[PDB]
Design brief:
The structure is a homodimer. Chain A is of the alpha+beta class and 366 residues long. In chain A, 19% of the residues lie in helices and 45% in strands. In chain A, strands 5-2-3-4-14-13-12-9 form an eight-stranded antiparallel beta sheet. The structure holds the ligand O=C(O)CNC(=O)Cn1c2c(c3cc(Br)ccc31)CC[C@@H](C(=O)O)C2, calcium ion and chloride ion. The PDB classes it as transferase/transferase inhibitor.
């Protein structure tokens, strides 16, 4: 095995294929990357047995076929640590891989490519293509609401839902919910899967904001994403996801609109004197005005008054201010819409200018 | 107690005094506020050191003192919009804070409960530019010990000699010294400033033209810059003599680009022992070679061009120490000054003798 390649053509691929690798593997070879020279192409693969990322690099300098595995962290650090515009010559010499460039030489330990574990083979039964940016928006809009290591394992992940011509993402930790729907211009079957949170992050981070389209394949227990030179594959979470349609407030008739930043800064100051554990704040809403109050066990008190667009009936309601701020921070828009009903119902939050993303927070009594 | 001040004027003072404060005596988690003689005084302390900020009151105000949670009060002010005006007043056991239509009511502890550092006398005084103090601390800070049982090493020596103010920091494995002339005839004297004080001292240098005034007593140091007064206790014990650590006659002079050299050591370090982190250097005429290897039999090798005349030698180092030096230097070229394979090495900016770094071999 032999190749010579520019440092810069190796770094992005190394970032991508390093993502999956867990910090304390059950096998020695799981700390390594698989390297293959074949048909004019170097492929790198990293895995953790749950998910896998393969990157491809075209080889325009002379090369010799073969495969081996090297420690991922070290080989990445060497390449990244080498100077800008460097040529990186790699060759397999016995049970060592030789890396050199200019007058820097490294000898890396190998494990055999034959021991590198592959993911279970599977069949695609739902496929579609879409702009990278559409996938990026779907995930960014909802990712923060995924559970982290809940015992309800199916919440530690994101629901991907196909219906008609749109793709929808949903996330919830059992307390707050985020949903986002985008049309993708392909007739799709009605289908639903749960991607594990680590898989969702790899996917998100494999999208480089560029013009390459993203192709998605979904099987019974697996999902795969292909964009340009990168192919990501992950297991699905085998569980049942809650129905998001049930939590959405029915016919909220009291819509409040305000500048996202102004509402955010007001909640952010009020939060300073909220309960540190339960983070409850009170909204008093009246004609074109909102008053926000907070207090903590030490009886310190905050109050914020802003001008808003609001014409409905006067009402009160409490919320977890961290959840509201998470929503306002994910939105990053000019104007926000808060769709209110009463003191005992939940609230749905959106960009004033767009219904594509919706967020649901529970009422707090105080 | 009442005052009304613009956010811009309150923010940096708050930031400075509040920065290092924790609960502990919960009142150590509070700032002392005093309105007196047209001035708002904001004071913070952990009993070892103290930061006092004065700010002029150009609007109507009323005298009096209280104590509020430092973090919450800073966060509130910081969270207010740019150009905002902040009206503060005492009412009951609470401190009211009003800006626009944002209102806040904070808890208080009595100003009488707020502790003072003991009185002391100045024995040594001088002034210097901020930029000089910044440079003196920056050059050496990373070589202080952190939590060594030799308490005298967890901190920085400040020495006056002739016209020079000098800083020294060592942890027993490596050492940094930096001397700067400050245009004054100084008495021969030294004190040890605790690392926490070093950091606050550093952080009080805004980067403006206000000079610094320093006062040293037998158990205290103080620095005035602009409207801030930092006061800290000193550390007991006999600090080592940097001249004993410096090599006596490092005849062998090596010269290389600092970034190039730093890059090589860093790459080589990848394949060094994870615990020891040793690298070998082989010096020969106009050439430096760096090698590293680990238990797994993995090997790194780097070869650079340098300006070296003198005998060939081999010497081992912990790479992180060499990297800390090379990153502290921030220069074009570095001089490596050597004696032999079992003796300390000295490292300087090739273009300045103003700072020197010493590292032991492995
Ligand atoms: O601190 C160590 O790990 C042991 N170092 C020495 O035995 C020699 N030594 C010391 C110091 C030192 C500093 C350097 Br660069 C090299 C060897 C050194 C500074 C602190 C000194 C003290 O104990 O007061 C000792
Ligand atoms: Ca340069
Ligand atoms: Cl010096």
């Amino acid at each position: 095995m032999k190749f010579t390649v520019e440092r810069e053509h190796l770094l992005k691929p190394l970032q991508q294929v390093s993502g999956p690798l867990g910090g304390r593997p059950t096998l020695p070879i799981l700390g390594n990357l698989l390297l293959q020279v074949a048909d004019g192409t170097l492929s790198l693969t990293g895995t953790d047995l749950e998910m896998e990322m393969v990157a491809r690099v075209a080889l325009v300098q002379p090369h010799e076929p073969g495969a081996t595995t090297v420690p991922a962290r070290k080989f990445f650090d060497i390449c990244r640590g080498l100077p800008e515009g460097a040529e990186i010559a790699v060759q397999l010499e016995g049970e060592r891989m030789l890396v050199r460039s200019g007058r820097s030489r490294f000898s890396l330990s190998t494990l055999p490519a034959a021991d590198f574990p592959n993911l279970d083979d599977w069949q695609s039964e739902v496929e579609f293509t879409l702009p990278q940016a559409t996938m990026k928006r779907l995930i960014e809009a909802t990712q923060f609401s995924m559970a982290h290591q809940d015992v309800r394992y199916y919440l530690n992940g994101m629901l991907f839902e196909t219906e008609g011509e749109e793709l929808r993402t949903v996330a919830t930790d059992g307390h707050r919910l985020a949903v986002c729907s985008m049309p993708i211009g392909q007739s799709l079957p009605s289908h639903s899967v749960i991607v594990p949170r680590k898989g969702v992050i790899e996917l998100m981070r494999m999208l480089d904001g560029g013009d390459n389209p993203l192709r998605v394949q979904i099987g019974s227990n697996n999902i795969r994403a292909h964009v340009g030179d990168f192919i990501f594959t992950s297991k699905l979470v085998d569980g049942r996801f809650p129905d998001y349609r049930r939590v959405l407030p029915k016919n909220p008739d009291k819509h409040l609109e305000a500048g996202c930043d102004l509402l955010k800064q007001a909640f952010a100051r009020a939060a300073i004197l909220s309960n540190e554990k339960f983070r409850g704040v009170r909204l008093y809403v009246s004609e074109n005005q909102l008053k926000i109050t907070a207090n903590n066990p030490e009886q310190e008190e905050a109050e914020e008054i802003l001008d808003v667009t609001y014409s409905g009936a006067e009402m009160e309601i409490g919320f977890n201010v961290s959840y509201v701020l998470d929503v306002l921070n994910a939105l990053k828009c000019e104007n926000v819409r808060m769709m209110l009903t009463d003191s005992v119902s939940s609230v749905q939050i959106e960009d004033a200018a767009s219904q594509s993303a919706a967020y649901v927070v529970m009422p707090m009594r105080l």
